[model samples]
Target chain A: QVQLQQSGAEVKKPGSSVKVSCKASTFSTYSISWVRQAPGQGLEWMGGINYAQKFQGRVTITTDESTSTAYMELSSLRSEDTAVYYCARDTGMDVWGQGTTVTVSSASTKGPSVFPLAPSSKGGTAALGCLVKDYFPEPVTVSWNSGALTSGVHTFPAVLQSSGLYSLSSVVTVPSSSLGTQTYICNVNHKPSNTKVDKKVEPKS
Target chain B: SYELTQPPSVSVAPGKTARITCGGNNIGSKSVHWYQQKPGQAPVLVVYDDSDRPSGIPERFSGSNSGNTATLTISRVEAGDEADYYCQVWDTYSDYVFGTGTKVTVLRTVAAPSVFIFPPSDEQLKSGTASVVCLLNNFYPREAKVQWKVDNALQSGNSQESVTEQDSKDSTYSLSSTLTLSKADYEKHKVYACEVTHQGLSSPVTKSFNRGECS
Candidate 1:
């Protein structure tokens, strides 16, 4: 009855593909995008706005570009892939339609990779980068910590630059307490997901 | 505990004047604290009760109050103020309760979900049928009442259920829950959800299927 309509149902096997439908009421004209919310993780942006023109990864959205239908598909399934997926559309000058969820019933448990950026040290300032993968729809945190920094720990902001990739970086004037050890850590604080990873680097000798 | 019990909804840009009000009814109000939530970091407390600025909070964040309302005033609307602002207060109950969150819609909309993961989202067994599991994380109480809502209707008889609570340095609480669906339900590909509700929340937040038969 609602304006936003998703696929009817999903039936798939391991290592298969599940393509779900997000039918915009035919009245809206905005692009439809896909996002994922894992059991306890944050909402992850799969990809959207039909970026790059080429559909390469999990977030595959195709629009009539003229018609009112938008389709998002998830390729290659695993047991851990069983979570909620949503389709959001921007309609008629405004972003309308509540998000719809598609549950990937079979996916693997091992989550996607989260890569940390290399910490940069120059001009007496150090900037660190950290990231998380495949988890979205929730805010993530990044902090700096090490036995190296003397004045306690410092936290940074983790924001999504693009789909499934979240980054947080911080640059501090090497604390006096940390000057000796010269070691700094960029940490991705995903507390609820029970996942936290850090990148360690020492200042220039 | 008196940190989150006051008027929770607050909106102020970096330069505009913002006020946060906090109070408690019966339990002697001890202290109130406010924090800032960046995208991927733990909450950073900006102000304490009686308008005391926390150690790390920038001087730009000023605190004041009259009567029960504790105000947090910012001089200039910064990109960071667009976070959920909460007030805490001590409840007669042992712990504290948080105000309905004030989501900061600054910059652009970002992906921020209440629940992260629900494990074993689907299960398969050789018995011609199997059970499906849902896992949630970052939940504190481990008792956040994770109920399975199918098609908006509550379902019973869940196997392999679990809930957990963990402590974080952020000075708050979180919870998680897991549910197991029946083999018959799994075969039907029934839409399952995990919902969490609290006293202050206007509605229960649900992690369910968006498109299919969801409740």
Candidate 2:
């Protein structure tokens, strides 16, 4: 069986650099290819180097016949340079490597903090909020715990931070009757960090 | 939609030149777009159609289409020039089909990684089963292998390895490996060790974990 094994996942800070490797196995002679997936995004074609040694822009690709390995490198990474990379053999688009995730965090970026607002006496509702600020690179995902409770959760789209990062504000208002548990959580998945930040909700009395 | 075929991976030294080609059935006379995708970011359109450079793209990058094939060429390859490249073509079905993908590597060897183990999160540890993460950072050439040992025995339980990421400024990489086990194992004084192997080092770099508290 032809196998394409990838290197590993990476977490990085801004203004730093990294390189990922993909090794080939099993097949004595075969073609290879590479692809990229941004955080929470679909796969994008990054072009490939085949038996003809063809490549696309800004990427340098090399293959070793003896070792059956293919290597790709990207330098001068930016906050936007975070993503998961993969390699596959070219037998009818046959084999693939495990994705190698790349996350680029910044000094100015901050994880999300949760704040609980007072329970509304007028209605049977409680309010909780998640605050994420000073985050670089645009995309982020803010999710509530359950789809049942999340139906009542009202989340505003991410706001642009002045530093070109992002600030997200999401509020979940649930009927006090629906909130059987004393605690609720706001999970924030940021692209740069490649990690999730969770804030607990303890609505004020 | 028709699909394009590409070589899995390729590499070149700095200051060199390279070419990437995409082949497909019935793609000879169609317009093709070439894109560059860096790790952790969105794709950037580099070349449009045959030989047309998008605004802000350097002249060093170019593309062309002939017969059932399209080609993207890069000249004066630099360290910053490494990334994944893809070609998109409009097919007869009126849909865009992309080439499989290609990885371009710049062959400069880098230093070995520094490994560290972090305790499980509160939630992870509270569930009776905990996940310990081993972080490998500041390495180069993006080739490091991680091994997990539980109480000096090779543990083969559920484990996950993340992708290698490059920093934008410093040009280093950070990666992580996570091992999951029952909390009872940690309470029993189970020691977890992470071993990292890299071409830059004669011996593997290791980090150990015994604590159960979250960091």
Candidate 3:
């Protein structure tokens, strides 16, 4: 029995920030809300005005408020902070959960370990994702870089849930160094709690 | 406690839109709920509280927010519109909640599988007394901890379970776990797993099965 679904896949690259998980299902009764929309996007209510009450620095809904169930956090991040992260039933007349897709492209801005993509002909291909708005059972990753060192493959794709929403994908092949010089990443690695999102490229001046 | 440790968050783009305002202190001014989690399905609630809309909801989805801040508007954003955006408040005595989770990523690249299983084919595993089901399609706040293992041990006999959800603000959900096995344990080839563990995730998903059956 899974409801209020969202666990991970909101890949990013623009500034770097990622945290997606909204898991709920008769956790006593209800109360788990976290929402956002991007990627041909539209729909945003990133403020859960109840539960554990901590709607700060962008959006964060945490619950131990009674253990019925709850969680929702987002930060820094860019590329419009990618989009698609949900864990509904925070309240608006019942039912909604099945949406998790975080893709902020450009390798989400690198740095969660690996960092290799330095051949430099100037390449570009980005799309990282993570979303499980609320089903709290996490295992989400999307990593890559072009500086070469400690990161490269933490992929995702094919997590489709119609009507409600739960889409996932990851693809990074960034290697640039020609016009503006240095600035290509992609990230979404949930560790220690490291959330990222970024995008920056050159060679068109 | 700094409002329980800082608060307020919002992000939108896919079709264009984002709003989140949770006026500090007890988070007074209530009425707002919205949820959507895309990727392996589960967590669907387009809008509530702020604007209110549910049940086969579609008009492209829309919501509004003000004061403490609560706004969820959707007009275009596509690419399955990556997701993350949350806001809530339920009062009867106490039901304080917050989750401005606006995270949607997917510019390209698709073909997912980190742990997936929806098998029961091959004539339902060759009909040896077949009728097996294990689906943990999406997890969040409900604090998921589903179990079902055969060969790996752990089976609690006759089954039929469900998990329903809806916290308003366009929140949506569904879940299933059914059982009925014994065709000699599907020809003595037991190996069916469906496990989910959570808390800021790192790896706790066991979805394994073999769907090719015959008497």
Candidate 4:
């Protein structure tokens, strides 16, 4: 009977600040938790590995019973602070916030580099991530090892860093059954001249 | 999850009255659906209403509920109306609680059954393999349905009726139905029930076993 809605994407510079909100509809009496995941990685933790230490003394957590709302605020941002945060229910359908990708960048203008992160699973689903960063000119496309997929693939609009270049991330989700015995390739089509091959591929930087 | 109980069987004179009563924890909590199954014929609704006869049912058949019981009263009974009578109740959206079903002896002739459910053994549970069994006895004709459920949820292919053993003595049929599961699952689940539905029955018969510590 209870539903949860979370805040949207956010971008900030080093030493800057950002606030993420989670709204629980129906009743405000329910308990809420926060979780984070790096762009190309698994959920750090809901309720992180040393994530206990990471935000120990640097964040504000609050639930307003009057408005049935909860908030998670982060300050003194760092480059490593980039992550998608969840105002979760355990939040355990296990409930969750849609996700707030808080990116803290310094800036860059160099050519694009393609890097892939290990895939992770959640429930019956698995997510694949491709990290394309430090690219110059636009006009690059990312794909999967299966070649072409309609959805389950999300390539975000490139985010310009404080340094000058862009950071692009793409994620694809498939059934968990696909990860067993079936390996994958993080396809990157860039302006610098490169192609998608099975396994890891290092293109122009 | 309540037993819909009715008399094992009832009889009356051709011109007399015969009342089939259905009982349960909350018989009046929800409306009842009544039906009759006659010899060499399909089960038919005696009266669609928990008491009022549907358009095609016999006018003498009546439905009425008092407190936690539902009674199907047939006035001035007809001898050829011999068949089983059943009362069905919906416990929830999908959970069906069927009466023990009553057989009106005057309305022709029929034989029905008895049900008992058995939980698996301690050795089997300890060995990490286990099962539950339902035993059916003394029912005429071979057509019967057996189903298993845990906490009121249907199991397997819905109507997975298995006749482990059958005998045709006294012009009747008897059979055994068994359900196998992992010992781990037996421990995880608490209530197991076997639902028996047969033409001889007024309604489905359910026998449930609640898990307990081995002595």
In angstroms, the error of model 3 at B18 is 8.4
What TM-score, over all chains together, does every model reach? 0.28, 0.49, 0.22, 0.29
lDDT of 2 by residue, B39-133 (tens): 54446668776678756788789888888878889988776777888787655453446777777776555767655565554444565655566
Off by over 4 Å in 1: A26-29, A50-55, A65-67, A91-205, B1-215
lDDT by residue for model 3 (B126-209), tens? 534444444443243334565777777777755444443321222222244545565666556557777766543576767665
Candidate 4 CAPRI category: incorrect
lDDT of 2 at B72: 88
Range of the 10 consecutive residues with the lowest summed lDDT in candidate 1 chain A: A90-99
Off by over 4 Å in 3: A1-205, B2-69, B86-146, B155-215
Identify the leading candidate in terms of TM-score.
2
- Stretches of candidate 2 above 4 Å error? A1-205, B39-42, B67-69, B78-82, B119-129, B209-215
Residues A42-131, candidate 2: write the lDDT tens digits: 465454562111223446666777777778776567756677877766532445676677777654545443333223222344444454
Per-prediction backbone clash count: 75, 66, 203, 15
TM-score of 1: 0.28
Sliding window of 10 residues with minimal summed lDDT for model 4 chain A: A42-51
Residues A1-205 of candidate 4 have per-residue lDDT tens digits of 4666778776578988888887777554456767565643333333310124446677777778787888887889886778778664531113445677676765422456554534422236654455565564444677776566644455555644444565565555566676655556676766444533333422112
Q: In candidate 4, what fraction of native interface contacts survive?
A: 0.00
Residue B42 miss distance in model 1 (angstroms): 24
